[PDB]
Structures are given as structure tokens and as C-alpha cells.
Amino acid sequence: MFENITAAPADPILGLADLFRADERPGKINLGIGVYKDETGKTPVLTSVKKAEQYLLENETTKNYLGIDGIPEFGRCTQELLFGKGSALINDKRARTAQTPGGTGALRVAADFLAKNTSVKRVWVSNPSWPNHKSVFNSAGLEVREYAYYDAENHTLDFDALINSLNEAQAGDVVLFHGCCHNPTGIDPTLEQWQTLAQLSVEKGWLPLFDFAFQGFARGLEEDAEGLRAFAAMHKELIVASSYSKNFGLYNERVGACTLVAADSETVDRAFSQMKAAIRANYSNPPAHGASVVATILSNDALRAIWEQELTDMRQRIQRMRQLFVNTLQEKGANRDFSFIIKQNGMFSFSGLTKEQVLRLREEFGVYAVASGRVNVAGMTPDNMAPLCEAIVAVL
Amino acid sequence: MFENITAAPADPILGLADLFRADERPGKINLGIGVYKDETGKTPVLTSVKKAEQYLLENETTKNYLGIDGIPEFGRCTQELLFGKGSALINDKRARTAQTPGGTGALRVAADFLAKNTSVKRVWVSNPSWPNHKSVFNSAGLEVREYAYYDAENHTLDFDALINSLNEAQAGDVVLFHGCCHNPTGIDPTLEQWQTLAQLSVEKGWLPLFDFAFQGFARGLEEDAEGLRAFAAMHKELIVASSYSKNFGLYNERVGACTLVAADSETVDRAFSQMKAAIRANYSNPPAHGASVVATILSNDALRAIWEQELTDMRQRIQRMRQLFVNTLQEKGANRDFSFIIKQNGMFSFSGLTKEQVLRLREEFGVYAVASGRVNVAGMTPDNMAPLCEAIVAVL
Ligand SMILES: *Cc1c(COP(=O)(O)O)cnc(C)c1O
């Protein structure tokens, strides 16, 4: 059966984690997958999730299966976070959320759902976007089309072009948005652009699918939610695939959410019984540990307060590394002005490096970066700043 | 978009857990989902997994993403368990295993894999089988066909009919087998039938897909693996979807395995790079907690010894409840001979009850059973035995 199955390509982000692992050089530097590291270049488990696990160890009685949609407290907390405490989507019982295995699991459950219970034929993703977006919607049966987004000469969002591009998406089509910290560019819409974009979506009949994986990483929890809340206010229907991997440092426990919203209580509940059927034909019901940890921190005032300080510490450490990086590239003789990266939000820098400069940096300096030129600023510490900056200048 | 999406049917097993939850009667009894309960009708978290979690709490340093296939130690331990320590599939590096979100996740990753990288059009499942089998392969794009299995008058496996049925499956087709504790019948093949079945599979060119979810629940860990090992010895290719939900009482942590085997090292590795690509387009990489717990117990002698005693305690408690149940139905005036259930292996009893007796037992006695007549003997305690037996006799 398996004789002429040919080898799949390496995953553009996960394939690097493998190559990095196999390298033997003592000074190599990672800069690839979006995982946060602290001042010491370690990825610690947050104190607040560690307190939550101790509690879960003392207080669990069973490992008996959760329902298809996960922990109720988990989806209620998620709706508060995404839409505001006492939102009208919450109060009119317009939103239903299933607990999924990460935000990727949320993107596929949504895909599956739409592919099997909707007229959708086409999802619209930005150019550039997360590499795996194309792969999840194509597995579902959906076609991926791209829209204009980034002006690379100017290092800005090209809103006119983004409008004109999207001008050929039909009514019935899904349009994917990043909630905040666009991946890979780091450039987000303004509030005024998000609302212009919200009102155009509705006069054209696009169903919005938000990928919200970095809430708390651009300006704050709530501030980062404004764009989505501006869409929630205009729209009868939305689906948001959200994650807790980064903002909770809970990467390998796989914890996210697919929250579905329709015009009313009856429609949302009927639409969700099909979403729960897609889940049951895939992994059946979700992993408890990580999601019980989120629910515990979010449920407890003391434990929530510790967590928000932790996430504030992470936004601030990335912001200092971002500034450090353009400062050191300048005084290391960078033969280009790199201060546009000061303006990007998130864990990353979309540096401008070509595929072959990126290739040469791993092959002879051992600094690993994604081939789109995307580098992880949260992977930068004061201790490896001068080494990677010296490497970059040597290839420019 | 969502206006005319109609409601999905209730899941035949999970829908009952919901109905049970909503019932208000103080004496209701569950008997539906296959979850083990102890003498007190509780589903405890095993002492050995509780010791493993304490250790993981002391000793973890990060929640950083696992690779697409999970924990290496986890897949190596899984191969020992499934095929024998020092097996030639292990020694010739013929087997590769991905860590999945339960055995359902393993069944779908396999489905996805085959649907996208193989000529397979049709999976063959027994009649009766696990209700969700049909649902996972149909989501993948695969057709489900059924083969003959159980003689209901005689309460036996009808091997002639099972042979003749399967006589119209072509070369290239998948045939699903249950490793041990057939669900729902509890009737397994003999060693002699498993080997007859193994040698027929190979002269006909069926690819075997084993669902192995109850290892340790019929006779012992190793004894329960004989059938699969008899197939492993004849076959160049196999795929086994295995679970640790029941034998580790780790139901909601979602822990299982899809292990793939090809004719040699090169083919298996090339076939697995595509299997890892199907995973990445679905939930991306697996939940660590449950799988790190399995790997820890299986890696440690002290902790392994405690676990095997625990699983031995569970096989034995179900065997005493099985015997109790036919004894009490007889002295409660059962108007049928029920001692064929003494012979079935596993958590269940395929009782013979019709859909309307099963319906009437939940509607006026509140004992919940699956509508195929399947009742969970591991849900029976000495304290609810007489109540449910009295209920059953009243409906016969
Ligand atoms: C991280 C991320 C996801 C998925 O998050 P996980 O929780 O790790 O699955 C999806 N899309 C984007 C853009 C992300 O950054």
C-alpha cells in the first residue's frame, strides 16, 4: 500500500525546530518558532499556571470524559475575554464555544464545520499570513485565496490595496483576520480601519473568521480585542479560533477555543450541534489539563492577578528586545535602516531578509530564522544580541 | 450563513451522558459510556497516575511545544506494549508511532493519511461495531462497508459468515479489527481464528487497521496482544490506533497512538512524513500531560508495578460483576437464560434487549443503557445490582 508514497516537505516552522535540534555548533541561536523566552533564554512554565496545577493535583477526583465542547467555565471565561464582560453576545446567548486542542484545532473544527454544513467554497487569507492556514483549510476541502496586505518598501499596511483585493471576494465567502499581532508582519489595522473594514464586510456579505492567538501581546487584553468587538457589534455571524498557547505559555498542553456566533439563541444552538458532530468525528472530546488550568486562573482573583503581571512582563521584555535589536544593528554597521521593526506588534520582526540571506545565516552562522525573513524577537536576550546582529550584518 | 443548518442527532453514547445528567430521580443508574467505576460507583484517578503527576509538577521546566509525533519515550513504550519487547518490527525499525488525542484521534489521523496518500476507497467494519467508527471514516472521505460477525441466537462469533462476508472485500481495501474486547459484543476470535484470519488477509491483500482500546481488559496485557502479533508476523503493512483512556483511567486527558508499519525502515519513514503532515493540518502537535503520565509510569519499575495491579483489580472487579449480574437476574425471576454474558470479555454486556425495552428502562426506571442493548457491567456495583436487575426483569 505504502510503496510509492513520497516524502512530504518539511514544515516551514516545525522543520526548523528539527534542524536546530540537530545542529552541533555551541553558539547556535533559534529565532524561528514563536515561543517566548525570558532573560536567560529559557521558556519557563508561568508561576500562576504552576500554582493552578498544584491545586488540580490536590483537588481532582476523576479523569472521566469531558463533554464534546469542553469545560463550561472555560468557554464562559473565553467569551468574557473575547467580547467583554457583560457583552450583548453573551447576554443574548448568541455565542457558543467548544474547547479545542490549541487554536489550530479550533481552525480545523471551524473548517470542517463550514465545509460540511455551509455553502462555503473559499476562505480568503492575507498575503503574507501563517503558513499553516493554507494547509488546515485545504484539508477541509476549502479553496484558499489571498488578499493584499503588506507594503514591503514602506513597511506599512496597504489598506487601499487590501480593500481592492477583497473587492473580488463574493457574498458567502469567509475572510480570515488576525485579531492582533499579524503573523508574520506584526502590522495591525487601526481602530478606524477595523471599523471601516467591519462595515464593508457586512455590505458585502463576508463571514468573518478571526484567528486570535496573541491577545495581550500588542497593547493589553482588552485593547487587543477592540477590532473583533467592532466586528461583533456589526455582525450577526462570526467564528473565532482563539488560543492560550502563547499568552499562557501553555504551548504543548494544546488549549484553545472555537467560538461560534449566530443571529440568536435558537440558530446558534442548532449550528453548534453540527460543530459538536465534526469534533466527535475527529478527536471526540478535548484534553482537560491545560483548559482546567486556564479556567482555574481565570476563575480566581489572586491567580488572575499573578497571570496578568506575567503576561505584562512578557509584552514589555519583547518591546525592550525590539528596541535593543535596531540599536545594536545600527552600531554594528547595519547597511540598512531597520527602525520600522520598532513599530511592529508581537513576538516577531518581519526583517526584510531574502531567502538566501536567511539560508546563509543558518548554514554558516547557525542563527535560525523563517525563510520569509521572519525572526522571533522574543527569542532575543542581551547575551546573544551582539552575536546575531553581527551575523545579520555579515549577510546584508 | 447559518439560517437553515439543521440540528444534528444526538450521539448514541454521548447523548446519553447528557440525558443521564439532566435526570432528577434519586435512584437513576448509568450503564451507558464505557468508563470504569469502583465498588463505590466512583471513577477514581489511579494511584500510579497520581504519583506520576506529582512528579511531573516537581520536574517540569517548560510547556514548549512537542514535535508533531509526541514524546519519543511514549511511542517506544507503545511499541513494546503492542508488539513485544524485542520484537522484530521494533528491531528492524519497521514501526513509526505518532502520539494522538485519544484513540479517536488516532483513528482519524489514520483515515486522513489513507484518504490523502493511498488508493483506499473503502474501510470494512464489523456488524455490530463502535458507532463512531462510521463517523470518523466518513469524515475522511471513506466509504464504510460492514461484515458479518455476531450470531445473536447462539451468542457466538459466526466465523463462517465472517469469512464469507469478507470474501467480497477487494485487494487494496482496509479491514478494521478490534484487538480484544469487541465493542459491543465482547466476543473475540480465538488464537487459531486470529491466525486463520491473518493468513487470509495476506492472500487477499487487505490492509489491517486494528482498534486497540481495551488492552489488559480480557486476559492480560500480553495475551490480549497475541492476535495483533499474529498479524504483525504475517504482514508487511499494518496501522494500529491504540488508546490509554480505559487501561489508564485517563479518559479526559486524551491519550493514544497511531502506529504505522511498512516493509522497511525507508518506506515507513517516508510514509510517516505524510502522516505527520495530516496531523499538522489538524491539531498541529499533541497534548503533553496524559502522554507524559503514561511514559513516566511505563518508564519506572515501581510505578509500572503499581499500575498493573490497578488494571488487574479492574479486570477482576468487572469479572465478579458479570457473574453477580447473571446470578441476580436468575433469582430475580429473569424470564430468559442470561449466562452467555459470563463468556464475554471487557467492560460490557451485549444483553439481547430490544430498542423499546432499552427505551422503557430509561423512561420509567431511569437505568441508562445503549439502544443496541449494550450495558456497561463495569458500571455495576453490589449496591445497585438488585435495582437494575429488578428493572430489567420488569421489561422482559
Ligand atoms: C499560534 C498560532 C496559532 C495556533 O496556536 P496554537 O494554540 O499553538 O495552536 C494559529 N495561528 C497563528 C497565527 C498563531 O500564531
Ligand SMILES: *Cc1c(COP(=O)(O)O)cnc(C)c1O
Ligand atoms: C474507547 C474506544 C475508542 C477511543 O478511545 P479514546 O481513547 O477514548 O478515544 C475507540 N474505539 C473503541 C472501540 C473504544 O472502545
